[PDB]
Amino acid sequence: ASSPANKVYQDRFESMYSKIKDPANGYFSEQGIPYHSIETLMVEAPDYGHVTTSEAMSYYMWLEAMHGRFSGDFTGFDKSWSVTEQYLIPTEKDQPNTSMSRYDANKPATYAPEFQDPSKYPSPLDTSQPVGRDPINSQLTSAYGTSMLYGMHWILDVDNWYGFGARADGTSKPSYINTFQRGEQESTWETIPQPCWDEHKFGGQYGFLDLFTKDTGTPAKQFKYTNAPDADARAVQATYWADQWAKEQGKSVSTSVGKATKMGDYLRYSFFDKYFRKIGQPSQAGTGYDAAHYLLSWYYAWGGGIDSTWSWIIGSSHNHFGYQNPFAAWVLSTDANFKPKSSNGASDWAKSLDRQLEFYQWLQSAEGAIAGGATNSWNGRYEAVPSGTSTFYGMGYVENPVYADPGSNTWFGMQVWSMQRVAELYYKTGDARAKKLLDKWAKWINGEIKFNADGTFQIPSTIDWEGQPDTWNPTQGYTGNANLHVKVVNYGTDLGCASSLANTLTYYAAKSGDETSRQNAQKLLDAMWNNYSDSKGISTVEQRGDYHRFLDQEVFVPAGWTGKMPNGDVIKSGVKFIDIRSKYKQDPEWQTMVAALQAGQVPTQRLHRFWAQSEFAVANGVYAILFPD
């Protein structure tokens, strides 16, 4: 029997759960897939409200796990896993084993440089540049009996809004698509949405392929998928809690545990340098594990031929603290129920847990906020790490890993999403490393929460950085990073971030006994319930400062290249964001937004992001469980 829960907060979770699952609210598609947001005019990471992400799926799992905890019904949790496997993990038809089985572990992929401006793309492939070897593929094919990868592709056009369809049919839904392909300066506003399955039926003469990669020969028809490691790890984290909660009530989610475990086994591809180069000695091809940084990097990607048989797999050299999940690492390396089938699965995750905790500590600023991360590929071309750039296992520090428009570590959300996982680990194990990190981080953020007399509140929104951490010496440990500082640029009322903050503070307060953290968590939860509730969950009005880019952001198209989007929009040099997404003019909020831009005003919106609503619901359940009285 599960322990008693605080009835007040349990009721708030149930109310939110009902609002999120209410078909009249429109959070899900007819196929049962949650959208990024109810509203369609949405550009921030995905560029359309009704595309979904693996991130949304992992929140859907967490939400359903918590619901099973309170209702004793776990069929919704099992359903979230069925939808994920059916629509987000490429099937046999999507990643033909005929091509995947032709993968060569001694030559995983062909090197191509990364550039700091989208105008330098397509990037030319170079077969003469060294590529290390993949030590885990043989472990995976042996344990699972297939060459296909079991991980979630990160973004999905749920209703086929772009019109690419399934496997080039232009008519089916959902539709696998990808966006980001052109480096750190390619914001969400500067991409050319493309299909994952490219048969050359849309776009230009060779589909969209030669917009990104240049080869000596003619581009072949091919598929390609990209994983978002933080989402796959959150799926493991959510499944662990569903397994614990189910077992307390004599129920079982055995089948979902096996999928989560298999996913965590493949998730190890993110522990490796993009082209399997040695960590700390980027000019040399790796010989196996010497190319493993053991951190959850920006992505792992894979693809292969459609009409000819071949394939490739890449990891990522860039690491952001925001993606780490020491809790998922603890689960996969110590819990017998989640022991991966592969030979080195559990032990690699045990190595990741230690390395992740070292990474967080190395990045902790003088004040307490966690700085960006590190890369094993300077400028994405394995260049020499400049002057006295501090390093972590030979990897140079980067303030904003991967993206600079805007900087990936300028959003406060990374702080809470990542530290929440550290709080869960500390709660479960009492780990000293987790405690040291949290004691300092919590003290910082507790001094940044502002409560107003009218019930509203504000938390850090945009942050900035100065300096760099001291070079990591594993034996000396934390130096205090006196020359690394965080600065809060502006405050706001991001409800998803505040909910994630409440969650982190709740786990931390339950273990440490820190009253300040417990009352700030409850006050955040109460303030949101009382002052921001609406018929769809919670919401507030926010300014969309970058929406002017809808009309004035030019998209780079290489000289001489012309193509068409499925709806007929012409892709050619000179196009703006809106020119290759003309369907946006039919959005119900379009006139309102343009009218605001015309009047010289910053557009505002009241948004219902699926992850934020789920984050709030989960935060209430966590508090109900940890603080019953």
Ligand SMILES: OC[C@H]1O[C@@H](O[C@H]2[C@H](O)[C@@H](O)[C@H](O)O[C@@H]2CO)[C@H](O)[C@@H](O)[C@@H]1O
């Ligand atoms: O890319 C991180 C994360 O961003 C989320 O959107 C943020 C956006 O980055 C920020 O500029 C704006 O102020 O707030 C929104 C909402 O928090 C996005 O919703 C996530 O899917 C994405 O992973």
Ligand SMILES: [Ca+2]
């Ligand atoms: Ca840019």
